[PDB]
Amino acid sequence: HTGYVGLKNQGATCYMNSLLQTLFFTNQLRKAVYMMPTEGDDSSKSVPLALQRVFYELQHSDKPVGTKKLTKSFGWETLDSFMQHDVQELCRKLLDNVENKMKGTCVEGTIPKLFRGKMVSYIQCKEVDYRSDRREDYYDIQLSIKGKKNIFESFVDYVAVEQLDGDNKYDAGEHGLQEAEKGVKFLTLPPVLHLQLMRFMYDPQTDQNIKINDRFEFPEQLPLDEFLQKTDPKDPANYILHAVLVHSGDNHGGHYVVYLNPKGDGKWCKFDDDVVSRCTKEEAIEHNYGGHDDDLSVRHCTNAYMLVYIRESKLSEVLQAVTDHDIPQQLVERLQEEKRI
Amino acid sequence: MQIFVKTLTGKTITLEVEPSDTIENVKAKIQDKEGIPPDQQRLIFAGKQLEDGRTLSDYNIQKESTLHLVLRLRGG
C-alpha cells in the first residue's frame, strides 16, 4: 500500500532493520552499492554482496525481505553481537566496508562524497601568543541532548569553547605546557548528515548506563549556515529531515522503528520490521521528541536517537531515481540464479 | 606527542603517546588517566574506528589529533 517493503523480524537484531531502510533510501548510496564489482565475491562471506542482495530485494520484492545472509556475512549471528555494538558502529563499519569495495571502481569515493564533512579544532593559549589549528574529517555528528531544548542548542554546545588547564594543559611548543582554550568549527557539512543523539550514556551519579527520555526537539528544516567558518552564497547549508530512528523503551531494552519520507517530499512512512505504513508528519517528528508531560498517567519513553538530514541543494541527486538500468546485469543474473532453492 | 581525547562528558583530556603505541597501549593510557577500562572504549579518529593490533602510525595520528571516545554500552 505504501509501495515500500519491510524487513523480516527473524531474530532479535535491535537497530539493524532501521539502519538498513535508512541506507536503502539513500538512493545515491544504493546505486553505488549496486555497482560494486562483486562478480568474484564469495556468495556467503561477502558483506558487499549481502548488502547488494538486501537492497535488490527491498527494491524488487513484494514480500518482507530476509536478512539472515546479511547477518551471516557480518558474522553477527546472535543477539549478543547486536548487544555489543550500536547503530553508529554498525553504520560506520558497513559504510567503511562498502567504501573499501568501491576503491578502484567507477564509484570510488561515493561514501566520502555523501557523508564526509570537514571540521577544524582550534587552540588558543591564554597567556602566551600561541595558537594552533587541526583539520579533521568527520562522517557523523554526536549531539549532546541532556539539558538541550533542540538541535540548535546542541550545535551551540558542540562548538562551545572548552578550557585546557590543570592536568590537561596544552603543549605549546617552545612555551611548554600552557593554559589554553579549544573549540570546534565546521568547515563543511556533507550532503547526507547523520546526527547521533546522545540518549544512551554512562551516568556517573547512579553509576550506571541509562537512557535519557527527556524532550528534545528537531525541525523538519534545519539551517546550519551560522555554524560554518565560511558559507557558500550559492549553496546554503539548509538541511531537510529524511529519517528519524526511534527507540521505545528503557534501561532494560526496547523496540526499534524508523520513520522516513523517502523522496524528501514530506510524505512520511513508518517502518516497523515487516509492517510499513503511511503516517503523518507529526507522527514522525513531534511524536518522537520525547518528554515527560503527564508521566504520572503513563510512561513516555518513545523518542529519536538518530536523525538523517539531506542538504537541500543535494536532495535531487542524493534521492535520484534508481532504475533496473542502473543495476549491472551480472548482479541481476547472480541473484535470480540463487533462488535455485 | 600530545594528542587529545574527547571523553564521554564531552570534555577533552590530553594524552601523551608515541607513534609506535598500539591502540591497546592508547586505551591503557586512557584508563590510566580517565579510569575507563579498555574493553569499554571505542576510539574514533577522523570518522574511522581504531582497531586493536594497529598502531597510531597506521592512522596518520599526530600531535593535537583528537580521538573521540565513545563507551561500549550493552543494548539492542
Swiss-Prot record, chain A:
Tissues with expression: Expressed in neural progenitor cells (at protein level). Widely expressed. Overexpressed in prostate cancer.
Subunit: Monomer. Homodimer. Part of a complex with DAXX, MDM2, RASSF1 and USP7. Part of a complex with DAXX, MDM2 and USP7. Interacts with MDM2; the interaction is independent of p53/TP53. Interacts with DAXX; the interaction is direct and independent of MDM2 and p53/TP53. Component of a complex composed of KMT2E/MLL5 (isoform 3), OGT (isoform 1) and USP7; the complex stabilizes KMT2E/MLL5, preventing KMT2E/MLL5 ubiquitination and proteasomal-mediated degradation. Interacts (via MATH domain) with KMT2E/MLL5 isoform 3. Interacts with OGT isoform 1.
Domain USP: from-to ranges: 5-312
TM segment ranges: none
Location of this chain's protein in the cell: Nucleus; Cytoplasm; Nucleus, PML body; Chromosome
Protein name according to UniProt: Ubiquitin carboxyl-terminal hydrolase 7
Source lineage: Eukaryota, Metazoa, Chordata, Craniata, Vertebrata
Organism: Homo sapiens (Human)
PTM comment: Isoform 1: Phosphorylated. Isoform 2: Not phosphorylated. Isoform 1: Polyneddylated. Isoform 2: Not Polyneddylated.
Disease connection: Hao-Fountain syndrome: An autosomal dominant neurodevelopmental disorder characterized by global developmental delay, varying degrees of intellectual disability, autism spectrum disorder, poor or absent speech, and mild facial dysmorphism. Most patients develop seizures. Additional variable features include hypotonia, hypogonadism in males, and ocular anomalies.
Catalytic residue positions: C14 (nucleophile), H255 (proton acceptor)
Induction details: Up-regulated in regulatory T-cells (Treg). Down-regulated during neural progenitor cell differentiation.
Domain notes: The C-terminus plays a role in its oligomerization.
Effect of mutating C14A: Complete loss of activity. Localized in the nucleus and does not inhibit FOXO4-dependent transcriptional activity. Loss of ability to deubiquitinate CRY2
Similarity-based family: Belongs to the peptidase C19 family.
Record function comment: Hydrolase that deubiquitinates target proteins such as ARMC5, FOXO4, DEPTOR, KAT5, p53/TP53, MDM2, ERCC6, DNMT1, UHRF1, PTEN, KMT2E/MLL5 and DAXX. Together with DAXX, prevents MDM2 self-ubiquitination and enhances the E3 ligase activity of MDM2 towards p53/TP53, thereby promoting p53/TP53 ubiquitination and proteasomal degradation. Deubiquitinates p53/TP53, preventing degradation of p53/TP53, and enhances p53/TP53-dependent transcription regulation, cell growth repression and apoptosis. (Microbial infection) Contributes to the overall stabilization and trans-activation capability of the herpesvirus 1 trans-acting transcriptional protein ICP0/VMW110 during HSV-1 infection.
From Swiss-Prot, chain B:
Record PTM ADP-ribosylglycine, positions in chain: G76
Record membrane topology: Peripheral membrane protein
Domain of life: Eukaryota
Site entry (Essential for function), positions: H68
UniProt crosslink position (Glycyl lysine isopeptide (Gly-Lys) (interchain with K-? in acceptor proteins)): G76
Annotated consequence of substituting S65D: Phosphomimetic mutant that binds and activates PRKN
Modified-residue entries (Phosphoserine), positions: S65
Localization, UniProt: Cytoplasm; Nucleus; Mitochondrion outer membrane
Glycyl lysine isopeptide (Lys-Gly) (interchain with G-Cter in ubiquitin) crosslink, residue number(s): K6, K11, K27, K29, K33, K48, K63
Record note on what altering G76A does: Loss of ADP-ribosylation
Name this protein carries in UniProt: Ubiquitin
Post-translational modification as stated in the protein's UniProt record: Phosphorylated at Ser-65 by PINK1 during mitophagy. Phosphorylated ubiquitin specifically binds and activates parkin (PRKN), triggering mitophagy. Phosphorylation does not affect E1-mediated E2 charging of ubiquitin but affects discharging of E2 enzymes to form polyubiquitin chains. It also affects deubiquitination by deubiquitinase enzymes such as USP30. Mono-ADP-ribosylated at the C-terminus by PARP9, a component of the PPAR9-DTX3L complex. ADP-ribosylation requires processing by E1 and E2 enzymes and prevents ubiquitin conjugation to substrates such as histones.
Ubiquitin-like domain boundaries: 1-76
Cystine crosslinks: none
Site (Interacts with activating enzyme): R54, R72
Function (record text): Exists either covalently attached to another protein, or free (unanchored). When covalently bound, it is conjugated to target proteins via an isopeptide bond either as a monomer (monoubiquitin), a polymer linked via different Lys residues of the ubiquitin (polyubiquitin chains) or a linear polymer linked via the initiator Met of the ubiquitin (linear polyubiquitin chains).
Residue positions, PTM (Microbial infection) ADP-ribosylthreonine: T66
Gene: UBB
Effect of H68G: Loss of DTX3L-mediated polyubiquitination of histone H3 and H4
